[PDB]
Structure formats: C-alpha cells, structure tokens
Amino acid sequence: SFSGYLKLTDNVYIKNADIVEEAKKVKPTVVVNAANVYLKHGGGVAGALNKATNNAMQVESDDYIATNGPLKVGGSCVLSGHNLAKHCLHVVGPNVNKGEDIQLLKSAYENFNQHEVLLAPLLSAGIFGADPIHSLRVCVDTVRTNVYLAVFDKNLYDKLVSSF
C-alpha cells in the first residue's frame, strides 16, 4: 500500500510527504506520533495528527493520562488510530529544547520493533531540537521492522537523502 518511497536499507524507507495525508491514504495498521510525556498534542506532528482526528486523539489521551500517569522519555503507549490508522503508537523522543538526554533517542526508536510495519515521522527532530541527520542514523541502526518515514519539509528530505 505504501508508494513512492526511496529505499534506504533492507527495512527503512523514506518519502517527502505529510504524515497526516499519508495516513489518510494508506490507513496503516500503525501510525507513530511524536508525543510528549503528558500526551499534550499541541504542535508539530502531534498537533497535526490530533487536528486531523477532530480532537478525538486528545480526548482519548487525557483519559489515558488520568488512569496511568505520564509516559517516560524514551517510552510509548498504543492507543486508537481513529480515522487515520488502526492504532497510534505514541512515542516520546527526548526534547533537546527542554534539556533532555539525546541518548534516550535509541530507547524511543526501540518501541518500533514491537510492530511489523509502521508509518512514522523522524523522532526528536523539528521542534524537539535534535539533529535530524542523527535521528535518521539512530532509526536505521535501531529499528529492525519495516518503517516508512514521511518527511514533510522538502528541504530537510533533500538534505537527509544527500547526506545518508
């Protein structure tokens, strides 16, 4: 069902695309959200995915936090994918702009290995403040399952491919 991707490795693929539009087209089994520990989906990929669900992702996430408390940096939880996917895997990469340890990025990507195939964004990139080239390197070196990476920014996509 995924089309137009560049193969980087045996199991990692990449495309210049909006992950929201990709999820609406493919209806993947799992879409990854670039979450924070409170599951407050205000901006970046999380704000865009939540708006595409008409805020249903945020209402579900608030009930999850009321029952379970916050996630760990490097951790994840599986919730509904609403109108975008069967499931959403909310994964917390470290936010460098909040002073979090970049070494937790490998632990964040290890959550992907629990799912045979995923549609995902680059973790800890964008407003999370990490170097996207480093994030793609950790993804390739950690994830063993089939990951389809959707990169929204065209200039970033071109830089990630040409420096890989």
Q: Site residues (CB under 6 A) for ligand A1CLX?
A: 18-20, 34, 44-45, 48, 121-122, 125-126, 151-153, 156
- Tell the smallest beta-carbon distance from residue 58 to ligand A1CLX (Å): 16
- Tell the smallest beta-carbon distance from residue 47 to ligand A1CLX (Å): 8
Nearer of residues 69 and 160 to ligand A1CLX, judged by Cβ: 160
Nearest to 126 by CA among 96, 92, 84: 96
Query: What is the C-alpha to C-alpha distance for residues 106 and 125, in angstroms, rounded to an integer?
Result: 13
Query: What is the C-alpha to C-alpha distance for residues 150 and 75, in angstroms, rounded to an integer?
Result: 21
Nearer of residues 63 and 155 to ligand A1CLX, judged by Cβ: 155
In 10 A of CB 6, how many CB atoms? 14
Nearer of residues 23 and 79 to ligand A1CLX, judged by Cβ: 23
Quickly tell me which residue has 């495309």 as its tokens.
15
Give the tokens for residue 34: 């670039």
Nearer of residues 66 and 143 to ligand A1CLX, judged by Cβ: 143
DSSP designation for 126: G
- Tell the smallest beta-carbon distance from residue 63 to ligand A1CLX (Å): 24
